C-alpha cells in the first residue's frame, strides 16, 4: 500500500515530462503554482546576482503559467544579517519557516 500511495500521492509526476518538478511538488497538496506566496531571495547584494536571481525567478513563473499580476514577494533576509558564506540558505530557510 505505501507503494501505491507514492504512485498516486507523492511521486505521481516523476515519470511525466509535462508536469514540472516544481509544479508537481505543489500539485500533491492541491496547491497550484499560484499559491507559491513568497520567494526568499538569496539577495546577496551583488550587482550580478540580484539581477540574475530575480531574472530566473521570473521565467520559472513565466513558464509555469503563474497568473498574470500575481507576483511572488521578495524577502531579502541578508539586509540584517549579511552573508554567512555557508550558513545562508539555512538562515533563509530558517526565516522562511
Amino acid at each position: 500500500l505505501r507503494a501505491a500511495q507514492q504512485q498516486w500521492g507523492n511521486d505521481f509526476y516523476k515519470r511525466d515530462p509535462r508536469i514540472a518538478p516544481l509544479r508537481g511538488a505543489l500539485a500533491t497538496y492541491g496547491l497550484t503554482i499560484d499559491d507559491l506566496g513568497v520567494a526568499s531571495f538569496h539577495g546577496t547584494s551583488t550587482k550580478a546576482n540580484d539581477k540574475n536571481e530575480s531574472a530566473t525567478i521570473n521565467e520559472m513563473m513565466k513558464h509555469l503559467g503563474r497568473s498574470e499580476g500575481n507576483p511572488v514577494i521578495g524577502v531579502f533576509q541578508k539586509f540584517l544579517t549579511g552573508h554567512p558564506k555557508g550558513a545562508a540558505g539555512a538562515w533563509m530557510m530558517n526565516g522562511a519557516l
Binding site: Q7, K14, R15, D16
Partner: protein
C-alpha cells in the same frame, strides 16, 4: 507476474474507460485528445 496481471487488465479497463469518455465529450478533434490520454495511460501503465 501476478501483479503484472493486475496491471495488464488494468489498462484494458482504462482504455475502454476512454471510449465511454473520448467519443462523446469532444468533437472529431479527437486524435490529439486520444494521443494525449492514450499516451498517459501507456505511461501510467509503465510506471505501474
Amino acid at each position: 507476474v501476478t501483479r503484472e496481471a493486475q496491471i495488464k487488465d488494468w489498462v484494458e479497463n482504462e482504455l475502454e474507460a476512454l471510449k465511454l469518455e473520448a467519443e462523446e465529450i469532444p468533437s472529431e478533434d479527437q486524435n490529439e485528445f486520444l494521443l494525449e490520454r492514450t499516451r498517459e495511460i501507456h505511461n501510467e501503465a509503465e510506471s505501474q
